[PDB]
mmCIF file of C-alpha atoms and ligand atoms in Angstrom:
data_model
loop_
_atom_site.group_PDB
_atom_site.id
_atom_site.type_symbol
_atom_site.label_atom_id
_atom_site.label_comp_id
_atom_site.label_asym_id
_atom_site.label_seq_id
_atom_site.Cartn_x
_atom_site.Cartn_y
_atom_site.Cartn_z
ATOM 1 C CA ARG A 1 -0.539 -0.250 0.123
ATOM 2 C CA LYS A 2 1.511 3.445 -0.832
ATOM 3 C CA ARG A 3 2.963 5.686 1.953
ATOM 4 C CA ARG A 4 3.471 9.241 1.295
ATOM 5 C CA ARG A 5 4.045 12.565 2.632
ATOM 6 C CA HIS A 6 1.446 15.275 2.943
ATOM 7 C CA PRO A 7 2.292 18.988 1.989
ATOM 8 C CA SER A 8 1.392 21.177 4.391
ATOM 9 C CA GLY A 9 -1.316 24.195 3.196
ATOM 10 C CA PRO B 1 28.020 38.545 9.786
ATOM 11 C CA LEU B 2 27.112 36.377 8.601
ATOM 12 C CA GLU B 3 27.848 34.245 5.469
ATOM 13 C CA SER B 4 31.498 34.674 8.116
ATOM 14 C CA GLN B 5 29.968 33.172 10.860
ATOM 15 C CA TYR B 6 28.847 30.024 9.442
ATOM 16 C CA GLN B 7 30.154 27.394 6.638
ATOM 17 C CA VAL B 8 27.217 26.701 4.458
ATOM 18 C CA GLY B 9 27.082 22.279 3.407
ATOM 19 C CA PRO B 10 25.169 20.408 1.120
ATOM 20 C CA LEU B 11 21.072 20.919 0.812
ATOM 21 C CA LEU B 12 19.106 19.375 3.464
ATOM 22 C CA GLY B 13 15.444 19.904 1.793
ATOM 23 C CA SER B 14 12.892 21.807 0.730
ATOM 24 C CA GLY B 15 9.772 22.754 0.447
ATOM 25 C CA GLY B 16 6.430 24.494 2.152
ATOM 26 C CA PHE B 17 9.396 25.297 4.784
ATOM 27 C CA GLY B 18 11.566 26.575 3.068
ATOM 28 C CA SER B 19 15.428 25.606 2.469
ATOM 29 C CA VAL B 20 17.768 24.005 4.859
ATOM 30 C CA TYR B 21 20.801 24.013 4.443
ATOM 31 C CA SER B 22 23.945 21.936 6.646
ATOM 32 C CA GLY B 23 26.563 24.285 8.180
ATOM 33 C CA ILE B 24 29.007 24.499 10.681
ATOM 34 C CA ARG B 25 29.184 27.535 12.858
ATOM 35 C CA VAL B 26 33.240 28.658 12.382
ATOM 36 C CA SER B 27 33.080 30.178 16.013
ATOM 37 C CA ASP B 28 33.483 26.650 17.294
ATOM 38 C CA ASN B 29 32.171 23.445 14.270
ATOM 39 C CA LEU B 30 29.075 23.414 16.130
ATOM 40 C CA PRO B 31 26.783 21.836 13.652
ATOM 41 C CA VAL B 32 23.984 23.736 12.625
ATOM 42 C CA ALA B 33 20.698 23.904 10.540
ATOM 43 C CA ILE B 34 20.627 27.405 7.953
ATOM 44 C CA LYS B 35 17.077 27.640 6.892
ATOM 45 C CA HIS B 36 16.232 31.002 4.326
ATOM 46 C CA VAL B 37 12.751 32.027 3.722
ATOM 47 C CA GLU B 38 11.689 34.271 1.306
ATOM 48 C CA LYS B 39 9.823 37.707 2.545
ATOM 49 C CA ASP B 40 7.047 37.024 -0.131
ATOM 50 C CA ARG B 41 6.135 33.741 0.588
ATOM 51 C CA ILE B 42 5.915 34.968 4.668
ATOM 52 C CA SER B 43 2.435 34.762 5.698
ATOM 53 C CA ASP B 44 2.299 35.919 9.050
ATOM 54 C CA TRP B 45 3.926 38.180 10.585
ATOM 55 C CA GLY B 46 4.855 39.070 13.953
ATOM 56 C CA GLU B 47 7.067 41.285 16.462
ATOM 57 C CA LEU B 48 9.715 40.158 18.748
ATOM 58 C CA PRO B 49 9.896 41.508 22.285
ATOM 59 C CA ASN B 50 12.102 44.653 20.870
ATOM 60 C CA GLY B 51 9.800 45.590 18.575
ATOM 61 C CA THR B 52 11.148 44.132 15.251
ATOM 62 C CA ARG B 53 8.730 42.729 12.877
ATOM 63 C CA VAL B 54 9.726 39.659 11.990
ATOM 64 C CA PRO B 55 8.132 36.248 10.684
ATOM 65 C CA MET B 56 5.510 34.586 13.793
ATOM 66 C CA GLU B 57 8.062 31.569 12.991
ATOM 67 C CA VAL B 58 10.618 33.434 14.239
ATOM 68 C CA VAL B 59 8.417 34.631 17.128
ATOM 69 C CA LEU B 60 7.523 31.003 18.311
ATOM 70 C CA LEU B 61 11.183 29.141 18.042
ATOM 71 C CA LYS B 62 12.597 32.557 20.697
ATOM 72 C CA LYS B 63 9.635 31.504 22.763
ATOM 73 C CA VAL B 64 10.352 27.787 22.922
ATOM 74 C CA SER B 65 14.147 28.309 22.465
ATOM 75 C CA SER B 66 15.388 28.502 26.467
ATOM 76 C CA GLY B 67 16.357 26.065 28.224
ATOM 77 C CA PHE B 68 16.808 21.982 27.028
ATOM 78 C CA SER B 69 14.012 20.855 25.395
ATOM 79 C CA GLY B 70 12.704 18.208 22.520
ATOM 80 C CA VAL B 71 12.156 21.339 19.607
ATOM 81 C CA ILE B 72 15.104 22.073 17.484
ATOM 82 C CA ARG B 73 16.251 25.122 19.088
ATOM 83 C CA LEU B 74 16.689 28.635 17.189
ATOM 84 C CA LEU B 75 20.610 30.033 18.042
ATOM 85 C CA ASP B 76 20.272 33.204 15.656
ATOM 86 C CA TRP B 77 18.476 35.014 12.840
ATOM 87 C CA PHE B 78 19.355 37.744 9.976
ATOM 88 C CA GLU B 79 17.218 39.639 8.053
ATOM 89 C CA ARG B 80 18.688 40.071 4.448
ATOM 90 C CA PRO B 81 16.624 42.143 1.326
ATOM 91 C CA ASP B 82 14.611 39.296 0.265
ATOM 92 C CA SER B 83 14.584 36.767 2.850
ATOM 93 C CA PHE B 84 15.491 35.609 6.682
ATOM 94 C CA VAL B 85 17.867 33.181 7.424
ATOM 95 C CA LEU B 86 17.773 31.289 10.430
ATOM 96 C CA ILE B 87 20.464 29.035 12.237
ATOM 97 C CA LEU B 88 19.221 26.372 14.045
ATOM 98 C CA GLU B 89 20.570 23.174 15.926
ATOM 99 C CA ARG B 90 21.667 20.175 13.527
ATOM 100 C CA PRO B 91 22.088 16.777 15.822
ATOM 101 C CA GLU B 92 24.204 14.129 14.251
ATOM 102 C CA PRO B 93 23.115 11.351 13.267
ATOM 103 C CA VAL B 94 19.668 12.190 12.473
ATOM 104 C CA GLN B 95 16.491 10.583 10.494
ATOM 105 C CA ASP B 96 12.857 11.966 10.423
ATOM 106 C CA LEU B 97 10.416 9.946 11.563
ATOM 107 C CA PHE B 98 8.616 9.757 8.041
ATOM 108 C CA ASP B 99 11.308 8.004 7.008
ATOM 109 C CA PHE B 100 12.234 6.408 10.221
ATOM 110 C CA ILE B 101 8.481 4.620 9.517
ATOM 111 C CA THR B 102 8.742 4.122 5.939
ATOM 112 C CA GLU B 103 11.978 2.003 6.455
ATOM 113 C CA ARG B 104 11.211 0.037 9.510
ATOM 114 C CA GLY B 105 7.711 -0.158 9.160
ATOM 115 C CA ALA B 106 5.021 -0.391 11.712
ATOM 116 C CA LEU B 107 7.103 0.062 15.346
ATOM 117 C CA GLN B 108 7.291 -2.249 18.670
ATOM 118 C CA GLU B 109 4.864 -1.140 20.942
ATOM 119 C CA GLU B 110 8.036 -0.039 23.532
ATOM 120 C CA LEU B 111 9.752 1.908 21.116
ATOM 121 C CA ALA B 112 6.155 3.830 20.084
ATOM 122 C CA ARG B 113 5.900 4.432 23.520
ATOM 123 C CA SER B 114 9.167 6.188 23.599
ATOM 124 C CA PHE B 115 9.108 7.956 21.028
ATOM 125 C CA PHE B 116 5.586 9.110 21.836
ATOM 126 C CA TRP B 117 5.699 9.972 25.111
ATOM 127 C CA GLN B 118 8.703 12.513 24.156
ATOM 128 C CA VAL B 119 6.738 13.949 22.297
ATOM 129 C CA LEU B 120 3.735 14.475 24.661
ATOM 130 C CA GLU B 121 7.108 16.384 26.944
ATOM 131 C CA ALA B 122 7.773 17.951 23.635
ATOM 132 C CA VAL B 123 4.742 19.876 22.861
ATOM 133 C CA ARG B 124 3.967 19.912 26.412
ATOM 134 C CA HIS B 125 6.517 22.216 26.132
ATOM 135 C CA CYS B 126 5.751 24.782 23.207
ATOM 136 C CA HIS B 127 2.674 24.628 25.225
ATOM 137 C CA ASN B 128 3.789 25.534 28.847
ATOM 138 C CA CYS B 129 5.744 28.741 26.326
ATOM 139 C CA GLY B 130 2.563 30.074 24.542
ATOM 140 C CA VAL B 131 3.092 28.726 21.713
ATOM 141 C CA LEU B 132 0.712 26.092 19.361
ATOM 142 C CA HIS B 133 2.743 23.961 16.708
ATOM 143 C CA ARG B 134 -0.263 23.540 14.688
ATOM 144 C CA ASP B 135 1.613 20.848 12.222
ATOM 145 C CA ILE B 136 2.295 17.553 14.675
ATOM 146 C CA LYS B 137 3.201 15.002 11.871
ATOM 147 C CA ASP B 138 6.036 12.512 11.512
ATOM 148 C CA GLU B 139 7.608 14.359 9.159
ATOM 149 C CA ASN B 140 8.242 17.398 11.766
ATOM 150 C CA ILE B 141 10.042 15.295 13.845
ATOM 151 C CA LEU B 142 13.677 14.557 14.240
ATOM 152 C CA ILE B 143 15.223 11.432 15.624
ATOM 153 C CA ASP B 144 18.638 11.757 17.436
ATOM 154 C CA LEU B 145 19.793 7.838 16.853
ATOM 155 C CA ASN B 146 22.645 8.048 19.341
ATOM 156 C CA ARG B 147 21.250 9.554 22.296
ATOM 157 C CA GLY B 148 17.240 8.260 21.310
ATOM 158 C CA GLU B 149 16.051 11.822 21.272
ATOM 159 C CA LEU B 150 12.954 13.521 19.170
ATOM 160 C CA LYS B 151 12.877 17.140 18.077
ATOM 161 C CA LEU B 152 10.240 19.381 17.190
ATOM 162 C CA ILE B 153 10.793 20.918 14.118
ATOM 163 C CA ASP B 154 9.069 23.647 11.353
ATOM 164 C CA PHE B 155 6.787 26.102 13.653
ATOM 165 C CA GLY B 156 6.078 27.417 10.065
ATOM 166 C CA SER B 157 2.474 27.178 10.311
ATOM 167 C CA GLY B 158 2.069 27.710 14.337
ATOM 168 C CA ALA B 159 0.485 30.089 16.356
ATOM 169 C CA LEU B 160 0.969 31.736 19.589
ATOM 170 C CA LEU B 161 -1.627 29.333 21.594
ATOM 171 C CA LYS B 162 -5.152 31.192 22.977
ATOM 172 C CA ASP B 163 -8.010 29.922 24.284
ATOM 173 C CA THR B 164 -10.252 31.292 21.672
ATOM 174 C CA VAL B 165 -11.464 29.912 18.546
ATOM 175 C CA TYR B 166 -8.777 29.540 15.408
ATOM 176 C CA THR B 167 -10.533 30.039 12.244
ATOM 177 C CA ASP B 168 -7.349 29.929 10.263
ATOM 178 C CA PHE B 169 -4.843 27.021 9.658
ATOM 179 C CA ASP B 170 -2.343 25.933 7.318
ATOM 180 C CA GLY B 171 -1.148 22.628 8.537
ATOM 181 C CA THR B 172 -1.309 19.342 7.243
ATOM 182 C CA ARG B 173 -5.128 18.392 6.230
ATOM 183 C CA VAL B 174 -4.797 14.809 6.899
ATOM 184 C CA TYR B 175 -3.895 15.326 10.458
ATOM 185 C CA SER B 176 -6.297 17.594 10.619
ATOM 186 C CA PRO B 177 -9.268 17.400 13.253
ATOM 187 C CA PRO B 178 -12.799 16.844 12.054
ATOM 188 C CA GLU B 179 -14.285 20.419 12.995
ATOM 189 C CA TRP B 180 -11.895 21.523 11.024
ATOM 190 C CA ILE B 181 -13.016 19.808 7.971
ATOM 191 C CA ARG B 182 -16.563 20.840 8.727
ATOM 192 C CA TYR B 183 -16.220 24.113 9.987
ATOM 193 C CA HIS B 184 -13.403 25.890 9.788
ATOM 194 C CA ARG B 185 -13.013 26.300 13.690
ATOM 195 C CA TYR B 186 -11.138 24.403 16.002
ATOM 196 C CA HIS B 187 -9.784 25.145 19.601
ATOM 197 C CA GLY B 188 -5.811 24.771 19.942
ATOM 198 C CA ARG B 189 -5.292 22.015 22.186
ATOM 199 C CA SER B 190 -8.050 19.720 21.511
ATOM 200 C CA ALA B 191 -6.828 19.922 17.957
ATOM 201 C CA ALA B 192 -3.925 19.580 19.200
ATOM 202 C CA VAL B 193 -4.791 16.244 20.620
ATOM 203 C CA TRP B 194 -6.222 14.605 17.495
ATOM 204 C CA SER B 195 -3.144 15.190 15.646
ATOM 205 C CA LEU B 196 -1.256 13.580 18.271
ATOM 206 C CA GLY B 197 -3.678 10.299 18.025
ATOM 207 C CA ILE B 198 -2.935 10.462 13.552
ATOM 208 C CA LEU B 199 0.583 10.245 14.883
ATOM 209 C CA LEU B 200 0.042 7.619 17.455
ATOM 210 C CA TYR B 201 -1.528 5.492 14.762
ATOM 211 C CA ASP B 202 0.924 6.018 12.028
ATOM 212 C CA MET B 203 3.589 4.632 14.643
ATOM 213 C CA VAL B 204 1.614 1.433 15.830
ATOM 214 C CA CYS B 205 0.555 0.528 12.147
ATOM 215 C CA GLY B 206 3.105 2.045 10.244
ATOM 216 C CA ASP B 207 0.968 4.618 8.072
ATOM 217 C CA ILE B 208 -1.725 7.416 9.178
ATOM 218 C CA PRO B 209 -5.387 6.274 9.159
ATOM 219 C CA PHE B 210 -7.250 8.803 7.128
ATOM 220 C CA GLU B 211 -6.545 9.894 3.886
ATOM 221 C CA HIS B 212 -9.671 11.389 2.711
ATOM 222 C CA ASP B 213 -12.114 13.943 3.933
ATOM 223 C CA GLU B 214 -14.660 11.831 4.611
ATOM 224 C CA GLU B 215 -12.812 9.121 6.378
ATOM 225 C CA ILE B 216 -11.705 11.838 9.089
ATOM 226 C CA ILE B 217 -14.946 13.131 9.547
ATOM 227 C CA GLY B 218 -16.224 9.565 9.995
ATOM 228 C CA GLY B 219 -14.109 9.009 12.423
ATOM 229 C CA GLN B 220 -13.976 4.695 12.827
ATOM 230 C CA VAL B 221 -10.622 3.830 13.259
ATOM 231 C CA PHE B 222 -9.934 0.613 11.576
ATOM 232 C CA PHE B 223 -6.894 -1.174 12.817
ATOM 233 C CA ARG B 224 -4.229 -2.754 9.947
ATOM 234 C CA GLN B 225 -1.348 -3.749 12.626
ATOM 235 C CA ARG B 226 -1.704 -6.239 15.734
ATOM 236 C CA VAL B 227 -2.062 -3.243 18.270
ATOM 237 C CA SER B 228 -3.030 -4.029 22.214
ATOM 238 C CA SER B 229 -5.694 -2.957 23.441
ATOM 239 C CA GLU B 230 -4.886 -0.807 25.750
ATOM 240 C CA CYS B 231 -2.842 1.367 22.900
ATOM 241 C CA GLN B 232 -6.185 0.945 20.522
ATOM 242 C CA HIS B 233 -8.101 2.669 23.643
ATOM 243 C CA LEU B 234 -5.744 5.900 23.745
ATOM 244 C CA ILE B 235 -5.631 5.971 19.783
ATOM 245 C CA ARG B 236 -9.478 6.070 19.563
ATOM 246 C CA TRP B 237 -9.784 8.469 22.431
ATOM 247 C CA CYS B 238 -7.665 10.728 20.938
ATOM 248 C CA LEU B 239 -9.781 10.700 17.699
ATOM 249 C CA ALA B 240 -12.802 11.340 19.368
ATOM 250 C CA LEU B 241 -15.247 13.108 17.233
ATOM 251 C CA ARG B 242 -15.946 15.724 19.766
ATOM 252 C CA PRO B 243 -13.390 17.479 20.519
ATOM 253 C CA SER B 244 -14.966 18.139 24.127
ATOM 254 C CA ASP B 245 -14.558 13.868 24.168
ATOM 255 C CA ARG B 246 -10.531 14.031 23.338
ATOM 256 C CA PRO B 247 -7.983 13.116 26.596
ATOM 257 C CA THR B 248 -6.154 16.370 28.095
ATOM 258 C CA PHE B 249 -2.116 16.060 27.951
ATOM 259 C CA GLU B 250 -2.294 14.859 31.775
ATOM 260 C CA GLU B 251 -5.140 12.214 30.614
ATOM 261 C CA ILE B 252 -2.758 10.978 28.265
ATOM 262 C CA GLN B 253 0.396 10.535 30.022
ATOM 263 C CA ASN B 254 -1.472 8.874 32.647
ATOM 264 C CA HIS B 255 -2.562 6.410 30.308
ATOM 265 C CA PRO B 256 -1.930 2.682 31.164
ATOM 266 C CA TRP B 257 -0.390 2.374 27.439
ATOM 267 C CA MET B 258 1.594 5.037 28.730
ATOM 268 C CA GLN B 259 3.344 3.910 31.450
ATOM 269 C CA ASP B 260 7.240 2.342 32.288
ATOM 270 C CA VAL B 261 8.396 4.326 29.466
ATOM 271 C CA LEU B 262 11.809 3.693 28.316
ATOM 272 C CA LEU B 263 14.494 6.678 29.043
ATOM 273 C CA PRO B 264 16.427 7.797 26.108
ATOM 274 C CA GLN B 265 19.830 6.413 26.026
ATOM 275 C CA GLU B 266 17.655 3.111 26.417
ATOM 276 C CA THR B 267 15.514 3.572 23.714
ATOM 277 C CA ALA B 268 18.910 4.371 21.355
ATOM 278 C CA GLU B 269 20.964 1.037 22.582
ATOM 279 C CA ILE B 270 17.387 -1.258 22.624
ATOM 280 C CA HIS B 271 15.936 0.017 19.692
ATOM 281 C CA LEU B 272 18.238 2.201 17.375
ATOM 282 C CA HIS B 273 22.071 1.060 18.066
HETATM 283 C C1 LIG C 1 17.772 20.452 12.399
HETATM 284 C C2 LIG C 1 17.082 20.415 10.609
HETATM 285 C C3 LIG C 1 17.358 18.968 9.765
HETATM 286 C C4 LIG C 1 18.535 18.717 10.019
HETATM 287 N N1 LIG C 1 19.358 17.322 10.467
HETATM 288 S S1 LIG C 1 16.219 19.103 8.993
HETATM 289 C C5 LIG C 1 15.373 20.695 9.349
HETATM 290 C C6 LIG C 1 14.045 21.302 8.635
HETATM 291 N N2 LIG C 1 13.286 22.246 9.193
HETATM 292 C C7 LIG C 1 12.555 22.018 8.466
HETATM 293 N N3 LIG C 1 12.401 21.305 7.360
HETATM 294 N N4 LIG C 1 13.474 20.443 7.655
HETATM 295 C C8 LIG C 1 15.967 20.932 10.322
HETATM 296 C C9 LIG C 1 15.494 22.361 10.987
#
């Protein structure tokens, strides 16, 4: 399963 | 000042926070991180005690950077024509908690307990100083791998702590609470506790529980890894849909799952070295 970062804003 | 006080090294990373370079203070070879922020990108401005108009991030860092703590401390700062430059501590060796969880998978509960305890102490320290971080997540946590100490970074979305409602938010949406999603209103402490529930799930399951708005406001927590009933209970409590149903920091640290935490040096020797 894909794990990803999430930008702020 | 100021290109003479520090030797600049490799770019560490860039994004919504700015551009951060490795560095060395020429005065004593202290490792630092050198963070540049462009003035045009700064939305929130504050005033230092002296009355100098600086980015809010500088205001907040100064309030939390005195004494030892689990926050990456601001050592100095400079104003340039188009930007501000921030000089921050740089522990070595380090890995951020996002990359750590990606490489190791779901963390053993003993290790998640030690990390989570240290994050609670750091967030309590910020709140004691009048500072709300508003972007607690694994990407904003560095692990000192030799000392077993966790350090909070990136106060660029933070605010002075208040007891009235917040109606602005620029942190990470998948860590933001359902009352923000639904009503664009939140109170600072209960919103922080929500993000800590997201973070604890992330540590013990290996990724965050919610990716979409409908999941955040639906408030059903499926556990994708084996997690003790005590840890599940704490997570679900932090993720209570009603803000007033969430625990205080005191109730989190008094929770049965949180007792008998490892010391930082024990954490390093057992789990990190
Ligand atoms: C001390 C430090 C790093 C190291 N080593 S990376 C980093 C940072 N800040 C925002 N984004 N990335 C800081 C403050």
